PDB file of C-alpha atoms in Angstrom:
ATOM      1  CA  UNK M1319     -68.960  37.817  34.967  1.00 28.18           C
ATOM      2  CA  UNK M1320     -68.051  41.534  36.167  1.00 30.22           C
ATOM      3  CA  UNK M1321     -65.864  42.011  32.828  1.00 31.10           C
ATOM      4  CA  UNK M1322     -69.407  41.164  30.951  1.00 30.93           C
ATOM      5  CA  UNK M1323     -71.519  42.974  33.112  1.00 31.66           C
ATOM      6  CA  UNK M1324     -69.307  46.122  32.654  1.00 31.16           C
ATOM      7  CA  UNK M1325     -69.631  45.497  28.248  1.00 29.96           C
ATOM      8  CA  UNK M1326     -73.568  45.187  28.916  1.00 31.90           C
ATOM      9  CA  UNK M1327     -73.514  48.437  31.192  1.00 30.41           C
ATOM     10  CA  UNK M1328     -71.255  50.823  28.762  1.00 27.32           C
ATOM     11  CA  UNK M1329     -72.828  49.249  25.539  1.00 28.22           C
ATOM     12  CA  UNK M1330     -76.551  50.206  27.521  1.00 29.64           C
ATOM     13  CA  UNK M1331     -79.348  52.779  26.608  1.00 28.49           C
ATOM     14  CA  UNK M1332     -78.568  55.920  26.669  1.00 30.02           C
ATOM     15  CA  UNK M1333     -79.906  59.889  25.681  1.00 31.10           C
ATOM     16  CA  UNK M1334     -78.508  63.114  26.000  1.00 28.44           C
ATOM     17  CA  UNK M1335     -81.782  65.392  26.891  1.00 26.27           C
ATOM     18  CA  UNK M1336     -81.742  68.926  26.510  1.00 24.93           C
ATOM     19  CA  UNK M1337     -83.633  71.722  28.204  1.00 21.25           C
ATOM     20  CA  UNK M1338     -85.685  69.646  30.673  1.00 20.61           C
ATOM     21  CA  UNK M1339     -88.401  70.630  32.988  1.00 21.65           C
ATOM     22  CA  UNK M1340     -88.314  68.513  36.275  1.00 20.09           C
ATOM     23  CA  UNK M1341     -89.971  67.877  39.982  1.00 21.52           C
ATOM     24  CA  UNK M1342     -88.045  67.132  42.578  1.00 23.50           C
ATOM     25  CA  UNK M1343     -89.674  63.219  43.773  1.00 23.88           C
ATOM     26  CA  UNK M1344     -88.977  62.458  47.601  1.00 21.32           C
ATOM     27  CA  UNK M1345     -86.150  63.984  49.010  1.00 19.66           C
ATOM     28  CA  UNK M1346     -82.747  63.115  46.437  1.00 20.46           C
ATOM     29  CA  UNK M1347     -84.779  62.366  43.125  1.00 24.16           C
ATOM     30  CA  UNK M1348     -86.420  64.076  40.031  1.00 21.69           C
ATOM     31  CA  UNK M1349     -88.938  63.168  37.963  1.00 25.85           C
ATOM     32  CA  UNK M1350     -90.003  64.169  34.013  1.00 25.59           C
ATOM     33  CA  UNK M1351     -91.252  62.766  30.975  1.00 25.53           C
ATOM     34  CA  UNK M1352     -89.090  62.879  27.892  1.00 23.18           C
ATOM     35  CA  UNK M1353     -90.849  61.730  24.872  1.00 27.50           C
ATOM     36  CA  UNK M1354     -93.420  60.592  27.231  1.00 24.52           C
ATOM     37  CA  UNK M1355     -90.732  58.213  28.997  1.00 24.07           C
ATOM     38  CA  UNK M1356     -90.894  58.414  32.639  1.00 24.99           C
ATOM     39  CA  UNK M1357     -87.515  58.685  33.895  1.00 24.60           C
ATOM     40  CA  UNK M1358     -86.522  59.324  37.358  1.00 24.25           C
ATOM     41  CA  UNK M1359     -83.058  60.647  38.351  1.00 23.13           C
ATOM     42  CA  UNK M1360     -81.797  59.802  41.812  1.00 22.97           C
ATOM     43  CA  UNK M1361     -79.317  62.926  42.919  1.00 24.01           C
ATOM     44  CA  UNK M1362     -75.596  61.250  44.172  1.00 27.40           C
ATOM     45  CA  UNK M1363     -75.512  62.360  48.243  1.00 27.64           C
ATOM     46  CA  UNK M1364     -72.527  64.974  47.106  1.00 30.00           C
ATOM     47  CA  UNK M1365     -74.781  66.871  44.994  1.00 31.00           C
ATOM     48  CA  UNK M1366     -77.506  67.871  47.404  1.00 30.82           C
ATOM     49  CA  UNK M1367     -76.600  71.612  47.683  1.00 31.18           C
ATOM     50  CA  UNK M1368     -77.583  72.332  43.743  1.00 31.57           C
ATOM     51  CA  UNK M1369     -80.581  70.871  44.031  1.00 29.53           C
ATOM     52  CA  UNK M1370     -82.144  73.093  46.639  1.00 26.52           C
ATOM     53  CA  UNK M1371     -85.642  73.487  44.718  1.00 29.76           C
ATOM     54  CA  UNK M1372     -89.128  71.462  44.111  1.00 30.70           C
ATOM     55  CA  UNK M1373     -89.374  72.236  40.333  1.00 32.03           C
ATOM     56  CA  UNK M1374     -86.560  73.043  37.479  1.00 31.08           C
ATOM     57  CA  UNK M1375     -86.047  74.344  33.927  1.00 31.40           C
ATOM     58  CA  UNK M1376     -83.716  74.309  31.363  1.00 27.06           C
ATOM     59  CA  UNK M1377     -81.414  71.139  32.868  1.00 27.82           C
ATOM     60  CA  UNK M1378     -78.954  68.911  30.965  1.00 27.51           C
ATOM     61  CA  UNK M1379     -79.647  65.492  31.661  1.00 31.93           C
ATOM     62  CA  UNK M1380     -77.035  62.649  30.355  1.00 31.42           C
ATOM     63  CA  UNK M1381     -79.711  59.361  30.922  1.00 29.64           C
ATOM     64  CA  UNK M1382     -77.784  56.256  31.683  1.00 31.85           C
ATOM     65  CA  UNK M1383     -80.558  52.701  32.045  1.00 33.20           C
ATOM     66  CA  UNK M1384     -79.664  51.865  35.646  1.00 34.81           C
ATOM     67  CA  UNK M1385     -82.814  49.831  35.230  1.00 34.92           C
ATOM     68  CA  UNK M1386     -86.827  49.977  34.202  1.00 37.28           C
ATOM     69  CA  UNK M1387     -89.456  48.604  36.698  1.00 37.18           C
ATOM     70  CA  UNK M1388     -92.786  47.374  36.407  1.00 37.83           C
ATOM     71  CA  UNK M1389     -94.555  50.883  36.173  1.00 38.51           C
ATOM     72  CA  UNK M1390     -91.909  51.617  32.916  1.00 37.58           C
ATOM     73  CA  UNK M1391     -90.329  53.893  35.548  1.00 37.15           C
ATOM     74  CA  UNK M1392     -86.449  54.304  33.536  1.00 37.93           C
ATOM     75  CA  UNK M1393     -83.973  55.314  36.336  1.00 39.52           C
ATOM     76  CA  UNK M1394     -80.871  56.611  36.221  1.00 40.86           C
ATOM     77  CA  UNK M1395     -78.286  58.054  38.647  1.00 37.06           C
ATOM     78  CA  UNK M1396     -76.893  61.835  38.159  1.00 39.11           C
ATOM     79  CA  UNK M1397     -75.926  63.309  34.873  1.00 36.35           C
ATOM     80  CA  UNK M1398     -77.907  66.543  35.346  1.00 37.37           C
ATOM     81  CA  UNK M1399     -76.101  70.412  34.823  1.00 35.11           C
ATOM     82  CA  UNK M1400     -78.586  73.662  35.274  1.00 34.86           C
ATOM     83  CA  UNK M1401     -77.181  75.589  32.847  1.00 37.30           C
ATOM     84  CA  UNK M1402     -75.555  73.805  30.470  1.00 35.71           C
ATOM     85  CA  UNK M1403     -74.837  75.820  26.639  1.00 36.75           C
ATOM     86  CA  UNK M1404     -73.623  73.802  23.780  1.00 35.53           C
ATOM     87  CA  UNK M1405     -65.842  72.700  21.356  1.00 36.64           C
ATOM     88  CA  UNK M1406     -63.063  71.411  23.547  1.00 35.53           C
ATOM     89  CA  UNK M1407     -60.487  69.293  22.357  1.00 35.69           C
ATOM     90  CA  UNK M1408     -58.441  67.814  24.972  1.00 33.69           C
ATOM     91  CA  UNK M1409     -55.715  64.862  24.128  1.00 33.48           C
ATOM     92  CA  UNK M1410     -56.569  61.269  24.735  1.00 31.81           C
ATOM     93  CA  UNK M1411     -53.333  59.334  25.055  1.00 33.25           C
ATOM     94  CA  UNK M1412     -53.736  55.058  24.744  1.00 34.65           C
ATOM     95  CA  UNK M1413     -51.188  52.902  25.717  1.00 36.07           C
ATOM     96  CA  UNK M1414     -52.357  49.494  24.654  1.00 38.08           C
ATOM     97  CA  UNK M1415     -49.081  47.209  24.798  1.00 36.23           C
ATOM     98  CA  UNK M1416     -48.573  43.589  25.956  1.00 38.17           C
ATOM     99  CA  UNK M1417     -45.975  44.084  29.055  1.00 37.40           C
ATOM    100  CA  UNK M1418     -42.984  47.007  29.024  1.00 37.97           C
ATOM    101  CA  UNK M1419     -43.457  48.708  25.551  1.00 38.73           C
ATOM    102  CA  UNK M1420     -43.952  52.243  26.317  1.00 37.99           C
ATOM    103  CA  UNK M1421     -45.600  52.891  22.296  1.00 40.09           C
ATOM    104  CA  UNK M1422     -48.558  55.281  23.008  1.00 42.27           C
ATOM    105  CA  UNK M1423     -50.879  57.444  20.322  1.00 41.71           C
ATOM    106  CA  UNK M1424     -52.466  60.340  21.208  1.00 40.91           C
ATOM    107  CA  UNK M1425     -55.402  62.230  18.936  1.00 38.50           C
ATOM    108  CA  UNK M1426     -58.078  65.060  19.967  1.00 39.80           C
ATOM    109  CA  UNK M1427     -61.263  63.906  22.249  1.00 39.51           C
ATOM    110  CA  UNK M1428     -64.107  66.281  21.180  1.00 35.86           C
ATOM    111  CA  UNK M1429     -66.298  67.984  24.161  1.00 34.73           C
ATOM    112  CA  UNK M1430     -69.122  69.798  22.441  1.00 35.60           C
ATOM    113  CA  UNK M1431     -70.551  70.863  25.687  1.00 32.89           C
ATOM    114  CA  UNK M1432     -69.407  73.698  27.853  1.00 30.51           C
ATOM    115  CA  UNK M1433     -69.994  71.746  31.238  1.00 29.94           C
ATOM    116  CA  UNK M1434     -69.958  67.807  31.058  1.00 34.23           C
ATOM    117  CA  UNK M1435     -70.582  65.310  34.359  1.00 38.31           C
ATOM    118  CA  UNK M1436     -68.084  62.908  35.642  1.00 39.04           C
ATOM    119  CA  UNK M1437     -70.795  60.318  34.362  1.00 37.51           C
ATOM    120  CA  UNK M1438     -71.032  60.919  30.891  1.00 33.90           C
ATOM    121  CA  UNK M1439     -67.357  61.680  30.333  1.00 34.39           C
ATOM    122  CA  UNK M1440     -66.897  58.203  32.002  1.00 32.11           C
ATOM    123  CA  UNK M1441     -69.728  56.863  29.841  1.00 32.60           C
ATOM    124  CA  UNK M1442     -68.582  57.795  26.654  1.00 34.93           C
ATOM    125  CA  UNK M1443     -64.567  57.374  27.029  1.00 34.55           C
ATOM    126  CA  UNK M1444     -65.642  53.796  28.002  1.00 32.02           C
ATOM    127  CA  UNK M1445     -68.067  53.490  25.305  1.00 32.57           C
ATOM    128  CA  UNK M1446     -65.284  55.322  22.690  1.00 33.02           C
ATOM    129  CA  UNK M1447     -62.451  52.700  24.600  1.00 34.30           C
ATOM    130  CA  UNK M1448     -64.822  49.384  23.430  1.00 30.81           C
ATOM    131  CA  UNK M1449     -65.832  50.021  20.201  1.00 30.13           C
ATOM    132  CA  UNK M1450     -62.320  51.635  19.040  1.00 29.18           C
ATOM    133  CA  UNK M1451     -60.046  49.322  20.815  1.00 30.27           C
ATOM    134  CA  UNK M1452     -62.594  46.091  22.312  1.00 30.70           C
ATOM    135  CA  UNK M1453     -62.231  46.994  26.179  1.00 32.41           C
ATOM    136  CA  UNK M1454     -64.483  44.252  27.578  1.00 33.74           C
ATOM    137  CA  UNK M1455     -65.250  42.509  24.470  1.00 32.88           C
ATOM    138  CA  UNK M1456     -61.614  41.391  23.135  1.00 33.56           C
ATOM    139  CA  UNK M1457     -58.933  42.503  25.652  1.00 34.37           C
ATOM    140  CA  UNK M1458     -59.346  42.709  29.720  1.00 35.51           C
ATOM    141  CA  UNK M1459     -61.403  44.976  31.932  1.00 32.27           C
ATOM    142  CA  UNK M1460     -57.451  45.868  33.762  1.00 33.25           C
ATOM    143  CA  UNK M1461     -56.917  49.167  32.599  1.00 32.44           C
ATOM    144  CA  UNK M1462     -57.322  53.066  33.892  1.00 28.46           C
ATOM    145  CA  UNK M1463     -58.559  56.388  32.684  1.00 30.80           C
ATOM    146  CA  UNK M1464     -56.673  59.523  34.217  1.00 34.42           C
ATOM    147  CA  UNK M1465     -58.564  62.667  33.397  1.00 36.19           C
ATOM    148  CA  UNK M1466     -56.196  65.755  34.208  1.00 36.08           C
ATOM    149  CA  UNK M1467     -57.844  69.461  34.617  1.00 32.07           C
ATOM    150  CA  UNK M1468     -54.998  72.554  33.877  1.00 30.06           C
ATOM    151  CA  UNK M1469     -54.641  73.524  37.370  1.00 29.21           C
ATOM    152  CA  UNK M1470     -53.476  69.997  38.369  1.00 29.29           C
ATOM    153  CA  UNK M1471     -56.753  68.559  39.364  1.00 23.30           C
ATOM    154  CA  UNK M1472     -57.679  65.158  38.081  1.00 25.00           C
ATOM    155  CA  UNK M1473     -59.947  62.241  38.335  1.00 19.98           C
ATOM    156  CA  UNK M1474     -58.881  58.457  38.000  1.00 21.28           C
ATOM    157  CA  UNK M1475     -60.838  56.019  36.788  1.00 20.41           C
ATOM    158  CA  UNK M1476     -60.605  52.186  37.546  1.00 20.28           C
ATOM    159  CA  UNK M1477     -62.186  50.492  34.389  1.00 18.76           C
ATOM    160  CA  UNK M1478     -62.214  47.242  36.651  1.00 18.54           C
ATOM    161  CA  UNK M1479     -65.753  48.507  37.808  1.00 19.81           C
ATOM    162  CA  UNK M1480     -68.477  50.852  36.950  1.00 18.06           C
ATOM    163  CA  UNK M1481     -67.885  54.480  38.509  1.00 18.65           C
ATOM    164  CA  UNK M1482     -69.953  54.901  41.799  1.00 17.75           C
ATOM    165  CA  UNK M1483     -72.968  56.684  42.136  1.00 16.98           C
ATOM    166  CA  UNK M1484     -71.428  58.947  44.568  1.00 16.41           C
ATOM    167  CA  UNK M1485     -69.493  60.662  41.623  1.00 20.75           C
ATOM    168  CA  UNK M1486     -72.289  60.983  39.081  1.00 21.93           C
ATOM    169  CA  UNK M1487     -73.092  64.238  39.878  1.00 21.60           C
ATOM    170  CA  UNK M1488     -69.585  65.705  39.878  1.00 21.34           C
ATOM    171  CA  UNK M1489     -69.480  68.375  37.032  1.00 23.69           C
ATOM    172  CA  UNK M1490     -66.370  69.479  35.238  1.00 20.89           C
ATOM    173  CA  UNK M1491     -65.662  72.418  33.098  1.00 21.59           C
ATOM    174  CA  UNK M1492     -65.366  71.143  29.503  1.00 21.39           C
ATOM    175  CA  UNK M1493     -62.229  73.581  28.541  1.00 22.56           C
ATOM    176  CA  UNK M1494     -60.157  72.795  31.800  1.00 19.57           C
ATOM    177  CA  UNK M1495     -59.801  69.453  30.659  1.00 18.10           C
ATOM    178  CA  UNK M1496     -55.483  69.047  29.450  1.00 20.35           C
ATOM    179  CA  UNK M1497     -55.434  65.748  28.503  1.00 24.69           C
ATOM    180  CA  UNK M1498     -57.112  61.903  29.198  1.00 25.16           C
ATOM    181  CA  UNK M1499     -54.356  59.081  30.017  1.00 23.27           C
ATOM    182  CA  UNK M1500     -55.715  55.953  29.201  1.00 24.85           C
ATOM    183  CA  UNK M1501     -53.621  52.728  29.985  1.00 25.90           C
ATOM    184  CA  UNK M1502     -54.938  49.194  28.990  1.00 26.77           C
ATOM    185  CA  UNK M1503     -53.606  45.428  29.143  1.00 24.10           C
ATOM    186  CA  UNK M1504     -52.123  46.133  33.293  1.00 22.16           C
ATOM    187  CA  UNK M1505     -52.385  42.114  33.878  1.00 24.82           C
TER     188      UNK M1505
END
């Protein structure tokens, strides 16, 4: 059940939209029309201090379907950047072995992006982890994603369930990304 809601999630609709004018809707959301798609963004609780404005230019907004209503309202949670310019190449490393066997191969990850959320790093190392290697689809949802930043910080995913909302807004610095540590198959 979660395993297949988690391949339905990560395989979902997505777009990367560029240079978007916004309103702020309520107090934590914003509202635009992309391609005359209404799509409303709910802001993560963390994030509250960037978005200190009623209306916006220019954002980056990574669109993940959370869900559509009714109204064919699209929602989505985070995955916005102010001033986002548009190539890092950090090292992915997958260990993908039954048990003990320490065998790991590690090849470029491409960031086009100068700044890139939490979310669609998340999004697309999942996406990149199913269709390359079957996470959720042939082998088990037990497996983690450390992202490591070259001053020592670093975020760890658990690809046992979706990322939190909270941490959708989170933005990271495309070239202080070292290396992603992916390990698969932990039982």
């Amino acid at each position: 059940h979660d395993k297949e809601a988690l391949y339905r999630y990560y395989t979902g609709k997505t777009m990367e939209m560029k240079n978007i004018s916004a309103l702020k809707h309520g107090k934590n959301n914003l509202r635009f029309k992309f391609r005359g798609i209404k799509i409303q963004v709910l802001l993560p609780g963390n994030d509250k201090s960037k978005f200190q404005q009623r209306s916006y230019e220019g954002l980056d907004v990574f669109f993940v379907q959370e869900k559509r209503d009714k109204h064919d309202i699209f929602y989505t949670v985070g995955g916005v950047i102010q001033n986002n310019k548009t190539v890092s190449a950090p090292i992915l490393n997958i260990s993908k072995e039954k048990g003990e066997d320490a065998f790991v191969k590690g090849y470029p990850y491409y960031i086009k992006k100068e700044k890139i959320t939490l979310k669609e790093l998340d999004y697309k190392l999942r996406k990149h982890l199913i269709e390359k290697y079957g996470l959720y689809k042939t082998i088990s949802k037990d497996g983690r994603v450390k992202i490591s930043l070259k001053d020592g910080s670093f975020y760890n995913l658990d690809l046992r369930s979706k990322l939190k909302f909270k941490y959708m807004g989170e933005v990271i610095e495309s070239k202080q990304i070292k290396d992603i540590e992916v390990n698969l198959k932990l039982e």
